Design a protein around this nucleic acid. Sequence first.
DNA 1: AGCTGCCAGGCACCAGTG
DNA 2: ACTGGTGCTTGGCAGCT
Lengths: 762, 791
Amino acid sequence: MQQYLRLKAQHPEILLFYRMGDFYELFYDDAKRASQLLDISLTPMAGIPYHAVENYLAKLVNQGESVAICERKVVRIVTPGTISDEALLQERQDNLLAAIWQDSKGFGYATLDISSGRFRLSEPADRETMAAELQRTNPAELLYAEDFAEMSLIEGRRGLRRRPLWEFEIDTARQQLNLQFGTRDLVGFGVENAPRGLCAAGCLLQYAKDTQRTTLPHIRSITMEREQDSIIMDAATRRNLEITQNLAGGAENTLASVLDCTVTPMGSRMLKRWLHMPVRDTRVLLERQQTIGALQDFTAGLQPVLRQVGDLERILARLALRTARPRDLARMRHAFQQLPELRAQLETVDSAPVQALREKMGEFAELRDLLERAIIDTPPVLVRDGGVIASGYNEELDEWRALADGATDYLERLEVRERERTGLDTLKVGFNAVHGYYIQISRGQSHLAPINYMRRQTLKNAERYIIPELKEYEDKVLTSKGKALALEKQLYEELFDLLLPHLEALQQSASALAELDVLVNLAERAYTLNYTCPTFIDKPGIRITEGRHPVVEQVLNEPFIANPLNLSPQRRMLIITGPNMGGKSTYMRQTALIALMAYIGSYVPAQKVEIGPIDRIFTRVGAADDSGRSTFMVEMTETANILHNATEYSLVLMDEIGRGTSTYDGLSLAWACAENLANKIKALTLFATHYFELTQLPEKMEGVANVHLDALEHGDTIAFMHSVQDGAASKSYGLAVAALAGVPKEVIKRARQKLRELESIS
Amino acid sequence: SAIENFDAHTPMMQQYLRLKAQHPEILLFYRMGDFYELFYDDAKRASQLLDISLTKRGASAGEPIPMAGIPYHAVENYLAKLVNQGESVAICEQIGDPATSKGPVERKVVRIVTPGTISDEALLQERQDNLLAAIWQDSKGFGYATLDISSGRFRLSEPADRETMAAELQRTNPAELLYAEDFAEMSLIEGRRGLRRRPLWEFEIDTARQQLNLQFGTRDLVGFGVENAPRGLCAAGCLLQYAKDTQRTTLPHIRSITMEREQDSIIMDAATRRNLEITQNLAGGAENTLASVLDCTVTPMGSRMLKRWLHMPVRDTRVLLERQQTIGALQDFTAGLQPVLRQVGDLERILARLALRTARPRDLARMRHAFQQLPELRAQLETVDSAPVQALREKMGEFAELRDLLERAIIDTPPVLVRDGGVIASGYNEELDEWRALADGATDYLERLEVRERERTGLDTLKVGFNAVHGYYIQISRGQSHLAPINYMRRQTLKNAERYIIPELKEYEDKVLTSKGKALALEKQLYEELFDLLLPHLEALQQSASALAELDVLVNLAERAYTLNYTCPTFIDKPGIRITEGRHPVVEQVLNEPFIANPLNLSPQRRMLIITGPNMGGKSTYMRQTALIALMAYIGSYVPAQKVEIGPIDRIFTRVGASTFMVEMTETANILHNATEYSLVLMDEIGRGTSTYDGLSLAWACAENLANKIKALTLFATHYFELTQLPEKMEGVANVHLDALEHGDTIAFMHSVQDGAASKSYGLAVAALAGVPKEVIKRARQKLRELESIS
DNA sequence: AGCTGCCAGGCACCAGTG
DNA sequence: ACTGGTGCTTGGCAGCT
Ligand SMILES: Nc1ncnc2c1ncn2[C@@H]1O[C@H](COP(=O)(O)OP(=O)(O)OP(=O)(O)O)[C@@H](O)[C@H]1O
Ligand SMILES: Nc1ncnc2c1ncn2[C@@H]1O[C@H](COP(=O)(O)OP(=O)(O)OP(=O)(O)O)[C@@H](O)[C@H]1O
Ligand SMILES: [Mg+2]
């Protein structure tokens, strides 16, 4: 079997599936990696059943592996960043291709969603912004230049693809990009003067094209992302705020789990994009708020109708690629059938943005009518066997079908005729591939078959025969069906030619429907969850009245205690003191989440919110735990990131810095960090701490005040109160907890004596 | 909902529903000819779990019956999927003969496949024990029992409290856990796999005693050392009933039960076990564990045994000296013994299948292969001067007769199953050989008939063949078929060929199949007979496999000791630990650079060490290697050090600092309530409160209690410099630290333990190393000099 | 070597004579 | 009450290409 080997040499860096009967089999290393990735026997050879290959392809692709199929020649390849088949994608997750490269001036980065055609480029200012973008976009497949210096950024990621340096040449990029978009220059996309980014996108587009060997007419635009356009959040922050993913890798108990009740998969994905990239331009935000408010009373009637639109976005991709299947057209039709109802319901809404979405949504009455006449109500999965084109659409087809039915009705009458004649009740006509049509009689009656019957196949308990009057009509049936089938196929490909001219307007429509779904959803969440519209002020500041954690309040069956916050250039840092279980962390995270939601355009969980501009959010809240430096090391590294990068427009949340080292070292560090944040950086800061010594800071510097949480001892337990009050904590509860936990009474008494001794010299 | 009373059901469903009523909560594979079928909700569930098609069976009266099923010859693949998901499955077979049965043939559930009850090679993992366990509790404590169905090993214990019980669950890691319906502490078992709620009556003491005595063939349990332990007996009683219920045959390999007493082993709490990464690393994997380094056994039963020793260190001085002696004596015979031991394989699990009467042909083959290694092992070991080695050499036995039997009765390389014959070799039984002669006359005859008839008729396409559906035949092409003799009886028609039969061929066929059936039945009768001949020696055979496995462990431990440069530890009368040049057995293998060996001196005068040093300076490692060295000494193994003198240890406790604080405090409370002068306590950065000093205050109070009242051997790593003052105040406490060097803007970690407290805490240096701006560090150093001037 | 479809062996179900 | 045909799972492989 040197055929497999020599054929593997073609794509050596890609897993090779080799058709062997009703299975695909991998050999050698390929068998290895495959077994430990899919959990199957490493009998070296491994394999998977032909009827489940798409399942295993989805898994491999999900783990960043490209896969070449073979049936003997490489007839198909799938790469993680360029798949478009529904079976291989996850409904509610974006699947991106990206390219990264480094210049002497900085980084170049680009991403592509091969289904929607959403194409973005950027030029991250440094290793830190780059890391945040990599984490935010989370590409399924990453193209990188060989000479990539700072490999620490991408090493460890799945789907890494090393590419030759010549693939990142700008002259070639501009040309290829201009040709793809059909323009002479890129000025209209606002990227004409962004070479690094362009080099990344040029490489990406070429890879995509090579992977598809098809035109990509749905990729008609590209957009540049600027640092100042969005609130910046690093991986740790992004992780610690649990936006779309909890700290345990799951999806429950995240912000998305409470905010994302969209009715469409494209809506869901778009909402997740918004959550991860809050915008800083209040014009956009004011527009989103207005819409949220205007849509309120229309939510109930709009959602069930929007639900029927489905994932038009991804279907449209298969239309552009010419791989759409009968039920894709059926769903597109069904989606077109909702447009007039959506138009009529949106007509009354007093909102310029809603009216624009309403126009952008379109109608497509012609395409609607076409698919109504061309395809049957509930077509099969594939066109392969026909039965997709409805009767009455084409005259020829209608005829061939009438002949086949006629020849079929004859053979049915032939059966009843041959029965009464021969008088053999077991007699019937059946069809098969090997023998085509045939006549069957049971064994016990077979000896009475007419002499003109020719014997073709004996079964355990029956004989099958043929006669000329049989093979005659078999031809009438087979030749007819065959033509009908060929016709259906041609009529089906014709549907593509009639639909594709409107591709651009169809893409705008799906885009609009996706945005409506997002906005209608946020309108329903605000009204349902008692949110309020925040207002924007000129200078940095946050004023919350009765704010809540939007996730914790929906999960716990205990009353959530709402809390105020007042931060301004005059009251810039709060030293938060008190218990562990008291509510410090929650209180800090809800501040960040409220800021985030305000900068997505959504209403927020409070009675009132006034908030200034915010360039970035830092949350050093929660835990260390790495392969893993050490808790204190990590905690200090994240602190260093905040002190090097925060500005006066930053929101900073710090959670008991100092734990994990000596008392004096830890106290000295916390004091110094807090002083630098307050007097030099001047960022709006929530500084949680266990050090009572830090509560003297407000008497040493302006812009710093003490707030705290307290507890209540009652019965045989402790009730950690969750109300933030002014001033410093005056109690500690560590000994009380130790007593409840069963620490022997003698030890507690000795610890009490030691505590007072320690706290007094202070 | 149609009213589904008995009489409204067909005879099939009356029989089925009645059987299903005996296994209401588990899947029932129902034998229906060539398929095992499931119905109603079982069909829907099976459809989902096995990815098979959900169909239906029509009904004259009522709703159609949801149906699913698989070919009987493919059950083992489907059982695998089920058992790997924790599903039990009852296997119902046809008992009667349909030909002589009026209505439905008699059916019976002959076995229940469950996660902790499997014995088939295809369902188990070679190097992992698969245990069935049963648990229960009353007001004073817990009853617990375990059984390895593939070895007969039956154990009972009575964990005194919750942590002990939790530690035991973790140590034994049962694949199936039976628990009494009134269990109060569900937190102990809530998350486990194969959890099985059981009725209270299955834990009745009188019934347990009666059933255990019946199973062991005794009048009382005095001889097994468990007459005294009714709380454990209740659990074993539940367990044995479950085991008999799942196998539904005798279990002659379960001939004994042993009690595991506290005093007999070093009791390790859960945090200790998970923090020393004995067989599972902290990330749940098998990489870089104690076992990954020490387990180079060559037999699967040996690998299992070694992991059992690692988790259960023994406190019997005698056992320990004997193991050491063996390890020292055999050190030179390693290379010669291992290749031969490897060939004995997993005789333990094969013997279980023998006992269960499920052993397949290749099990007897491997058993035979194992018997053929004994003479060489006997020879290799006679020289080795060591009483314990000769005791093992004897226990191992030889079984010459049994070896010869299997050599005479089974072919060199038999097939996977007995079902289709070809297992019993020729010369073993004359009747069998005779019946086979007929079945093997096949091709001289068949070819002879073909030629003869081809020449006589002159039809060159003529051929003789066989078909399972239609039988033997003479084939002539459609073209020349019209020229066949009129004597030829038409049997089967094909598209381009015609098949016929003649009396001669029919007659040959009628005897080739009856004799084939005769041969196959005799083969199966003689295969069963092998069991009857082997079983009487089951007891001596189990002793043999047990000795073979212990030999594999000790031979392996001897090779590790030599290869990894270990030394033999000695034991002292009083609690204490004296290590010269000690290393962490795992860390020193993974780490790509020399490991810095360190000493340790613990005694009743020097019983608590306060350990300081910078982050990443080696604190946790130093503590962990102390525990591992102790652990390794108490399995009878040599140790990673230049020298080690160690006293008695009853328990090892661990507390690794980092809701929480509620758990940290609960656990430290457990330590203070249960540690003794013979305990080894490892406190890693404990004491964490809500303010500056409450946590430190508690760690201080805790340390004082450990030093002054309990007097246990304690290693107390901390970053609280305040605690370096303890030695001044308390007898028995001393300072040690991990050395670090600060040269300009860098910090080097020496990794070596020195006496006294560290010169300084390196928090600020470590923070500067983490990238914290120099301006901040400069402010912090200023703040620090204010604080340092208070005293 | 690559598709199709008969068969395996339980029991019940049904239409056609008693 | 008989007789003789139908159906239903999935794996194996005859029978045709
Ligand atoms: N405002 C609130 N109302 C009701 N419950 C709350 C509130 N805040 C917090 N909780 C509950 O209290 C629990 C503990 O809160 P949290 O982790 O924030 O305490 P903390 O010890 O003050 O934080 P840290 O010490 O980590 O800075 C949370 O799990 C949450 O369920
Ligand atoms: N004796 C030793 N020889 C060589 N390397 C060592 C030694 N002890 C520890 N190391 C290495 O140094 C690292 C840090 O050790 P350890 O985790 O015990 O430090 P630590 O003092 O517990 O502080 P932290 O908890 O901050 O890591 C370990 O990963 C280990 O690889
Ligand atoms: Mg440590």
